[PDB]
Structures are given as C-alpha cells and as structure tokens.
Specification:
Keywords: Flavoprotein, FMN, Kinase, Magnesium, Metal-binding, Nucleotide-binding, Transferase. Catalyzes the CTP-dependent phosphorylation of riboflavin (vitamin B2) to form flavin mononucleotide (FMN). Can also utilize UTP as the phosphate donor, although less efficiently, and it is unclear if ATP and GTP can also serve as substrates or not. The protein is mainly β. Helices cover 11% and strands 46% of the residues. It has a single domain, classed as Beta Barrel (Elongation Factor Tu (Ef-tu), domain 3), CATH 2.40.30.30. The radius of gyration is 15 Å and the shape is globular. The relative contact order is 0.30.
Length: 136
C-alpha cells in the first residue's frame, strides 16, 4: 500500500532571495544522480496554505562536498509530479540540509521553464502531487 497527498500552490515571484549557480558542472551532476536528468537554470516558486517539511516524506540527502577548492553545503532533494491543466511533467523540490523552522514556501526545479510552456502568469494556481508511504 502507498500513501498519496495533494496540495495546491499559487505562482509567486522569488529569485533574488535565492543565490546559487546551476550552469557549473557539479550542480548538474548531483541533480542528474537524484532525478536522472539535468534541470534547467531556473525555479518555480509556489506559496501554499499549509506548512511543508521534507523530513515527513522519504527524500535523498547528499553530504557536504568540495569543488575547485571551495566548500559547498549538503542539500536534501525529493522527486514530485507537477500537474498543470491536463498535462503532467516530472519535477523536484530542493531545500538546504540545515533547517531551523517550517514555512509555507517551496521552490521546485523542472526539465524546462513551466511558465513559458504553459503561458502562466503570477497568481495562477497549479496542483502538486507527492508520493509517500505509511508503516501502519
């Protein structure tokens, strides 16, 4: 048996608050290992009406690593399925390994920029599907 959950999120603007590089090699390598593909250089930021914590579902964690003599911090990643209109595309949610409290904001990565492919504007609503399991 498997436990499934569905949550709704609205398109919100957010990019300057997050500061990292995707074009460099090591980011594409670690993403393709966890997801099996290299995500595009961008994010989809959704605001939810409910708090979210990746430690309530089964995610994959990656340890602290170094590249070109610089230290980068470990991160947690969990696959998702993104439903917009009548189409479903594979995506994933990304959050740093270090977390203090829980929030209602999640950032997603995808194979391509969803905002262009679906002509989506800020305020529009899309549905996210999360897979999980219960020991019972």
């Amino acid at each position: 048996m498997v436990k499934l959950m569905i949550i709704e999120g609205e398109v919100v603007s957010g990019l300057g608050e997050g500061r990292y590089f995707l074009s460099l090699p090591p980011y594409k390598e670690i993403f393709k290992k966890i997801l099996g593909f290299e995500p595009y250089e961008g994010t989809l930021n959704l605001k939810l009406d409910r708090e979210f914590d990746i430690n309530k579902f089964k995610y994959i964690e990656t340890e602290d690593f170094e590249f070109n003599g610089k230290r980068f911090f470990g991160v947690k990643v969990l696959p998702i399925k993104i439903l917009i209109g009548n189409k479903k595309i594979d995506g994933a949610i990304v959050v740093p390994k270090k977390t203090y409290h829980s929030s209602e904001i999640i950032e997603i990565i995808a194979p391509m920029k969803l905002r262009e492919q679906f002509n989506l504007k800020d305020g529009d609503v899309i549905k996210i599907l999360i897979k999980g399991d219960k020991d019972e």
